[PDB]
Design a protein around this ligand. Sequence first.
Ligand SMILES: O=P(O)(O)OC[C@H]1O[C@](O)(COP(=O)(O)O)[C@@H](O)[C@@H]1O
Ligand SMILES: O=P(O)(O)OC[C@H]1O[C@](O)(COP(=O)(O)O)[C@@H](O)[C@@H]1O
Ligand SMILES: [K+]
Ligand SMILES: [K+]
Ligand SMILES: [K+]
Ligand SMILES: [Mn+2]
Ligand SMILES: [Mn+2]
Ligand SMILES: [Mn+2]
Ligand SMILES: [Mn+2]
Lengths: 517, 483, 512, 485
Amino acid sequence: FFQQQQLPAAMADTFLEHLCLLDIDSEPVAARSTSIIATIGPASRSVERLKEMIKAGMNIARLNFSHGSHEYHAESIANVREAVESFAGSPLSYRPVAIALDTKGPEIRTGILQGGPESEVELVKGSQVLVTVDPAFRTRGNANTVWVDYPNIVRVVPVGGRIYIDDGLISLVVQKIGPEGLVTQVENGGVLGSRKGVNLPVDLPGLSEQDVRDLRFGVEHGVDIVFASFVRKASDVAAVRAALGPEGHGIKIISKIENHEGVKRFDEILEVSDGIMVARGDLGIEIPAEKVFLAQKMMIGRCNLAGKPVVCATQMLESMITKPRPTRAETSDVANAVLDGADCIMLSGETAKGNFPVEAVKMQHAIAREAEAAVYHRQLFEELRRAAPLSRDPTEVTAIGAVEAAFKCCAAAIIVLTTTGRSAQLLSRYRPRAAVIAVTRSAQAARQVHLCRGVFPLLYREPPEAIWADDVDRRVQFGIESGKLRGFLRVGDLVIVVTGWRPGSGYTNIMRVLSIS
Amino acid sequence: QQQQLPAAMADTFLEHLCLLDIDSEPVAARSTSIIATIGPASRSVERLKEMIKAGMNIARLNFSHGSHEYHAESIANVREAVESFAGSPLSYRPVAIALDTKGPEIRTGILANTVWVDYPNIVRVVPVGRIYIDDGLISLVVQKIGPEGLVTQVENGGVLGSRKGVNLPGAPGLSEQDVRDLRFGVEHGVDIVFASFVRKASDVAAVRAALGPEGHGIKIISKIENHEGVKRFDEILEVSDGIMVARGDLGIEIPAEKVFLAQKMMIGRCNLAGKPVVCATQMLESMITKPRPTRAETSDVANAVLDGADCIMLSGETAKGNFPVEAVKMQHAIAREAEAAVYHRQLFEELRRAAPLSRDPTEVTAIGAVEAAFKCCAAAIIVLTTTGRSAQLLSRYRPRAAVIAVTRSAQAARQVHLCRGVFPLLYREPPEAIWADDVDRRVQFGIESGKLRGFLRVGDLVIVVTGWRPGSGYTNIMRVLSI
Amino acid sequence: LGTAFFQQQQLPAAMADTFLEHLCLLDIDSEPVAARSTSIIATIGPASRSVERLKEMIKAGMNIARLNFSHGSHEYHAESIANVREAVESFAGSPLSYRPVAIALDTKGPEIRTGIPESEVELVKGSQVLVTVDPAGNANTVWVDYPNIVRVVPVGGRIYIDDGLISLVVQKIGLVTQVENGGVLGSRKGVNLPGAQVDLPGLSEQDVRDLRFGVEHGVDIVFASFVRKASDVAAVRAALGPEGHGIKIISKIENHEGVKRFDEILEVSDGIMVARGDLGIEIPAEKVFLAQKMMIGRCNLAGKPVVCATQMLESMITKPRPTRAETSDVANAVLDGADCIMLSGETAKGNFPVEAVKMQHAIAREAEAAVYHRQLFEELRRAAPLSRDPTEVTAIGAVEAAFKCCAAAIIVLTTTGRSAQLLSRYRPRAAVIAVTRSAQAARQVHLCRGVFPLLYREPPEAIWADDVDRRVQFGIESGKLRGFLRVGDLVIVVTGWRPGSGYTNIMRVLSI
Amino acid sequence: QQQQLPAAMADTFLEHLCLLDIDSEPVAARSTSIIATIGPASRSVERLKEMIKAGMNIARLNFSHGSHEYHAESIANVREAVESFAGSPLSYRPVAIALDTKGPEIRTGIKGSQVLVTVDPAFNANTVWVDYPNIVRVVPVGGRIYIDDGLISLVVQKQVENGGVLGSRKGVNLPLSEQDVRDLRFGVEHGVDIVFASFVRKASDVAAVRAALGPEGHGIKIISKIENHEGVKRFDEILEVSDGIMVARGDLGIEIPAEKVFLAQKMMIGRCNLAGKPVVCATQMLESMITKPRPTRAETSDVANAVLDGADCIMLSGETAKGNFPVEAVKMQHAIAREAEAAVYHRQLFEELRRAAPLSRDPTEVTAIGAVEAAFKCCAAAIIVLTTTGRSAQLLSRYRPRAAVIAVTRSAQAARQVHLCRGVFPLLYREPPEAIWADDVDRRVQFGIESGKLRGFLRVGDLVIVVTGWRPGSGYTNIMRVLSI
Ligand SMILES: O=P(O)(O)OC[C@H]1O[C@](O)(COP(=O)(O)O)[C@@H](O)[C@@H]1O
Ligand SMILES: O=P(O)(O)OC[C@H]1O[C@](O)(COP(=O)(O)O)[C@@H](O)[C@@H]1O
Ligand SMILES: [K+]
Ligand SMILES: [K+]
Ligand SMILES: [K+]
Ligand SMILES: [Mn+2]
Ligand SMILES: [Mn+2]
Ligand SMILES: [Mn+2]
Ligand SMILES: [Mn+2]
């Protein structure tokens, strides 16, 4: 109890008094429920660096298949698994880490600039720039002319349209459509390098030939999660599932909502996906920048309703690419994503290319811990309660009973046994304040539950005891011992233990109140 | 749907009222206990058997009249009728016996105008500016305190005043008779005591001392009957097992149009504390003479259940009326409809937030069990309990599912009738050698009894609440089961 | 606000954040105000017919006099109307304390009456009994005033007699029955036939003459008995004619069909009466409170008056004090949201008609202070649709303003009563003092909870704005004299920008 | 469906989130005021006119830098740009001038674990100088001291957290000066409207500022900047004596841990909403737009979440003082604020504000809540209120009505000062009083209707709520009327 983890604010009767009672001297618990996804790149590739990021709090390593070869990414996977497994010799402190593959998706990139792949050229504001796809001008990239790697570009944009280059920094307005070149008037000028992104706010297919190879690669190397780029409809997810094949039927598909189409068809995309990523990078270019927060809050709420994980990504701590501490806007954005109900937060260039990858992970860890305590659980739990339909599934029934029991005694943890992760996910979807300590024998499940907020996975490695009830108790004790070592639990704490009545997944039906001795 | 389910789910209380349907039949068993007063109309063994089948749960002995031998016959006939069903343990219904004390009574003198009372401090307790006599018929105001006594100015005329009851509004805990009657109740093993005229905490402490250590297990229900008991209600409730709103005397001691305020205040505070509350007096008074009640009486019973009362009482309707069995049936039918019409959505929400954080594993398991019951609309919550406390902590959250309580204690089985929603089952088998099998047996006994009595069907979901070791106070386990 | 002021009117329970805490804070020492908002309808009969008796009940608080046309001739009811109006107008010499009293006509409706004169036949239970269509009554057979009764009732059907006290069962098959419940049988009592569809016309030909009588004598309200469908009321309005177009029609819901078709009945009616007497026989007694609470809530949603009637204080027909069930029934009807409460035999035949009125007055005062206005107002305002009518917009603003300062009253000027009813629609705690020049509006607004009508009798001032202020002042002086207002009280004043009905649009905060 | 009405009507906040629509366009004037700091990028009259048209409502003078003559030039340029629109009174936009005090600053002098700092006037990467003479009594053996906006830190040396390039004269942090007094006197002389009081730690700091403004600065609003741990702890006593609060995340983010700043922001905004007083969110809202034409995703959400929290004002610092896109940054804040104001869960916000607002017998307070309720009942296009000091407009703004509060006033100062209150749009009435007072009241009401029609607020057929008083002078507001245009 005490005056810690914003408990006075949690006991408020209105959201207004909740805000009034928030305290900067009320310290949070050590358990951080929002998972951190860190992108792998030249700054976070060495085994030595990855060990620091795992200790700092990185839960999922993201491989961005828009850059680098299959051989390059196989080296990233090997270095991650080498860093993760160096801690395995101490099972009570072992932290599982998931590997996520981010697909290239339907991209449009420019041509290499004349003079060198590492030289610059400027565009004049209000000038006249010609956009061409002619194969001859592929290496002619200059101030007056730019090449695009998308042939069917002249038959999609009307007169007066808009073409964005380099993360929406450069803007071109279509004036006339010419024979073998698109005449534009620059609307927003700026420096332009080589082979930058192009957004067109399309007939490029939903799943490319190269992304098919990329998905098979992820199955052969046993990735746990796929981030599918530019998901526009349900069949875009089915195509990714089909390319994964029966070999990868257990891989979680997280749909990236990156344009107006994805937001419009969100309901049909969410029903067929395991989760959603709000990809505010491209989404900030495909729809007006002042509206991205609407799309993020909408998508987070509907995922919290559905009980499916949602990832918030891009530019959360962007200034930390070059500076050791973030701006006030960036700290508030991470805190507010946690407040909205995000299950995971992501770092992109902050860990891939920046000079402070470990410090960015440490900052997200510190912010999320404070923000999680500031969640107004009293109204959140009540609303998730009413919105969720009645259930005859004993796992779901037990889950809500355990969460309510945890709120009643301010339990330090809910310890649940799970093989597939489902029992921990059904606890997570009701957003308990107590940490959900999930003890599993499945290494894959231990990595995959990082998607669900508040679930701390522990990989159990011992062969079964001869009496199953003894094997259950040993696993519960392993969760308590790990919680003690990691600082989640102390003597005298109350804990809720969630198990089933028989071995095998799907039989969870028991909730017990235990005190830590 | 049935059980007024469209109304119980409504977003607002106004929409809840709008959706109440007279064609939505009640399905759950009725959870408000019926207390019937024993009298000439309900003293024979065969009539008591009729009233048990009609839904009587507690037999009230009114010690305001009758000799000790008279009440011993009442106890023997009640126990004979109750035990005639013990041949079928799966359907046996325990019936509590409650002793209602006579309490301190100020009566006038025997043998004109300006009478005297046996209470000698009447001159000191009534200041200048009212005294009611004989059920409130005569009313006197005082305008001067002199050495002879009071002035006795007549405000309302009246007659018939030989040793009649005196009430003084606005202004010991146990008479010698109550001490003897309370000893009788211990020696005859009564389960509940209705302490009359409780106005402070020391009053119920004196009842406790008269019961002695031999009667430590008896429940003490404090009857609030005057203005002082209403204003010191918080201190009274703290030391009592429950409260009875005694509207009869309360309606004389305070203005009759204020009694409903006292009733709703006390029921709310008892609901808040998780303690049983009894609403009593003239609920179906016209049925003393007529076979059907008035519209006000039928509304009165329903509103007492809606207010949150744990038990409703019948006085002359069963003690001396011509339709004692029909009066019990009428209370049963009304209570069933009223319980389904409870706006359960706001009730459970408010009880949840008002109940404070607790680290007691029984309290933690209880709220988890009630939440789990709502999530699957479980047919019942089966709980094993030695003293009934585990079943009372479930009842305090007013679940819709029945709380089926399996106990070996015959006294605790009778006493849990005070808590709304608790259906006691008396287990009679001797303990198994291994304790975990004894627990399984009792849980299955509650299942099989629930199946016979229409509580449970094959395919239903039930919430079972047990503990990790024998003895009371260790409840900590909640399980979801299918029948 | 003054701390002593905060201790009355149950304001601590009003400020509670939950209904549970609202219950826990109710205080028997918290005294209410003198202004009771729930109107009292009293049935006129032998016990309440003398002019001197009507005077005592006006002072006791009777607001609407009910003529029960089930009994008595037109000449009987004309003398009743004359006596009521004489007692009412006897107070008109003092305008500031004049209490308008509405006259309500309760129709006979499709009734069925047993057989006869003042002897009494007891009836044995389980004795075979015949019901008689023959115009050619003992314990073995009795006759009835319905020739087509043999056509409708099936074998194994139930017939009720004398407030459903006696129940006949057609054990074999006029109809030879055997008795389910036996009792002392009077002369010409009531007969109810639940479940069986009767082919009796909702507007009989005697009903048409009674409604014409009410229009010719200028009654304000019609209680239409046994309304089963929307065109039952359209028939009543057609019988009233263009002359009776201003009479309020209250539909009495008395049987299962009326409850099932309640929504279409409410749409064409000015209000609803929960007629618990016949309802309690036509449907199981255990379900009446479900029907009462359903209709009160739906009327409160629709903003139309609802009356609760029958056996509220029934023991007071013979006793000077009611039972504890009766006092809580009145209180709970007010707590449910009823606009009006009714007395039947308590004032028509009983020995304590004035005391019954006084008892209902005292209970209503206590129960009105115990309403949880916080949730009631929030739910009424959330359920009411958005409006572009300035009268509705001003009304909700004035009620909210009255809650903010615990205003002693809302003073509204109204000619038709609509501005007062829209204020009453949102259930303010403050009394709605309605100043009107229309004597009929002053009578009919008693249907709306919380509205205290004042009849203004002066010719207009020549500047309309001054004429508005004189009526506001008349409202203030009247409230001061009746105890509703004191110096230093805040009052909300609701008026319009121009004369004529329909232009209310102004709310003002004034100190007394 | 427009302006997020499906989201605003929802029965639960969770359903409100699910119903937010990127296609639902805002159809309502922007209610959150924009404060732009004046500096080299925004001193020219031409740039100030573009920023006025872009949405700037308050011009901030940072007295941390620049002499009195530099700031007099800034005031003159702002007023010349503002008064350039006075030719059309129906569209004239008042702009307030706010003085931001220097406060008790500590600056440095004009890598390796050993570093010496000393206050010696006779004293590179090895030795730096500071201006604070003594500090040896405030720091214990546990605390630390920060250099250069928190980038370089040192514990009780008696060189942690790295520390890169350090320049000449940058801040020093430690987790009423004579200069401040002459600055506040300067502000009274030049008729500034608002004072931002730096580093307010207790209620007596506010009394000192009010004393330095003299009896001639009675009408100047004092906004207290909560900048450190003590200001957060004694917040309630500071709020009670201030006209408003600024959450100064810049310094606050160094004085307390950066991860805790959002907690302090939400606490102060909520308490200010409770007390009905204006609160400003400040510093680094759109920092990247100093060098880039478009903001980061974090910055867009940060401005939107400040509005959703309930801030009455949002601030721009280097984005408008020194950046390369000062007009575009104002345009961006205006655009984000409009979208976020429609996304507010008005159903629960209005309910919680009304139940938290205590009962009152003041007729202005009673009229205000009646008018806001009336506005909700008809979706009034606006609430037109006549006011001399602005108090009647502030009492309406307290309840956060959906309708715009059009405040008509003769006081040029009050017109500028009500910009601190969210949803208040001031109009300055210039005509002289009519002979009959009632005609002068109606003509001001019609002035607000005419101005509202020209600006797009009002439209023929719309319903409006008009709030007036019964006698001249302030404090007598007591009338609410429903009118058709
Ligand atoms: O002088 P009049 O004609 O009585 O009008 C005064 C009142 O009539 C009103 O229009 C209200 O009347 P209604 O309630 O019948 O609509 C207002 O203008 C004013 O309060
Ligand atoms: O908001 P404030 O400062 O209290 O001013 C409100 C005042 O404006 C008025 O409407 C007009 O007053 P003036 O004619 O003096 O400008 C007064 O009735 C009212 O008291
Ligand atoms: K990608
Ligand atoms: K009738
Ligand atoms: K400054
Ligand atoms: Mn992308
Ligand atoms: Mn008694
Ligand atoms: Mn009838
Ligand atoms: Mn600062």
